[PDB]
């Protein structure tokens, strides 16, 4: 007998014979499981560390949510699915289209391919945004799929989420957006869908509230993944598959002082190029947002006709807080991102700065603690941990956040 596949994006996924499941623990750098495994809150995940397949796994670059939660659900880079950022700019026209409607991913997702061979498919997410992206191709009139995120869980209908009522079916309140509890619902929800619609594929995934507000080992954070560990004991206890990465890590980006350490790219580019005759782009989150939300380690700038790239890019290699400044070629290549969606240069700042856009309008310092942030290359490396004895299980730089399902079906297969 030869064994059952499913080909999705060039890659062959071995049908599970058991659940397999993907947990993405949003921001999770590994210390954060570190702490509060030596803290004796996460007992499950001890022993499925000491049993299974403990890794690190390297993300896409940007370090960010989407780009790399819809690498994870296509087990591709950016350079296939297409979304690299939250939002694209248009050189011409100056507008601004965003990376978020599922029109814009450019290859099916491990879901679809599945779904579409037979299979039992899940996806919850804890933001409704992602949860249409990722959901793109599922369809919910055989029984067969249930995709919902915790924030519009009690939207949720039989015909376009393949259940009524996420809220009223798990028994839980829709929780506060910002909250450790929207995470908490996607981890009930995947142990629910577990129990009671048994998928062939499951993925589960977070925020990174928690991790942009608290450091690994502080209470609030110990406390957070204390909670996670039950249901993922609850998950592994079920039998299904699992592994347990994130989409990126995090780390602190504030001065001595406590306030944001920024580089303004768009002031530097205005001294040396005109106002406005370059464009710097903030791919971390929406552009019209300035509540000090907007603060990642990865920018990328699309530069005026008939300008010196070279030169421009050596002017701010030499800023001391840019580590990185590429071509649009060059970047592309290396971290493996579609030409058509990035600017003329990528700029990665250093591990405890940020990039700006300018001073003039500034970003809205709101919330009071220290700036946490992620995007950069010291956000890459996470936690890969499989339940599974898996000594042929590749490490960093060669294993990937988005081998996650390869390895799951893997696992489960
Ligand atoms: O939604 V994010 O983890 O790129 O802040
Ligand atoms: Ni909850
Ligand atoms: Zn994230
Ligand atoms: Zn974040």
Sequence with gaps: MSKISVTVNGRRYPWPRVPAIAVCLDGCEPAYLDAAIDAGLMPALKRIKERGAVRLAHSVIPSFTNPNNLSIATGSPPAVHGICGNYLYEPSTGEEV??????????????????????????????????????????????????????????????????????????????????????????????????????????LTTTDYVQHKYAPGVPEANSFYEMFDRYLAELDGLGAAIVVTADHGMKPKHKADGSPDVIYVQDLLDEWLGKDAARVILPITDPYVVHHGALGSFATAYLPDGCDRSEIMARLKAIQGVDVVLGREEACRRFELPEDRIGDIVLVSSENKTLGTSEHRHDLAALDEPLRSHGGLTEQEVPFIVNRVLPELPNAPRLRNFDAFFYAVTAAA
């Design 98 to 203: 965003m990376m978020n409607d599922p029109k814009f991913l450019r290859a099916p997702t491990i879901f679809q391919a599945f779904y579409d061979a037979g299979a039992r498919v899940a996806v919850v997410t804890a933001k409704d945004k992602l949860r249409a992206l990722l959901g793109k191709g599922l369809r919910f009139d055989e029984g067969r799929a249930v995709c919902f995120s915790s924030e519009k869980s009690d939207k949720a209908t039989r015909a376009e989420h393949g259940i009524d009522n996420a809220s009223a079916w798990l028994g839980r309140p829709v929780p506060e957006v910002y909250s450790a509890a929207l995470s908490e619902f996607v981890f009930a929800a995947g142990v629910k869908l577990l129990r009671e619609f048994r998928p062939d594929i499951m993925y």
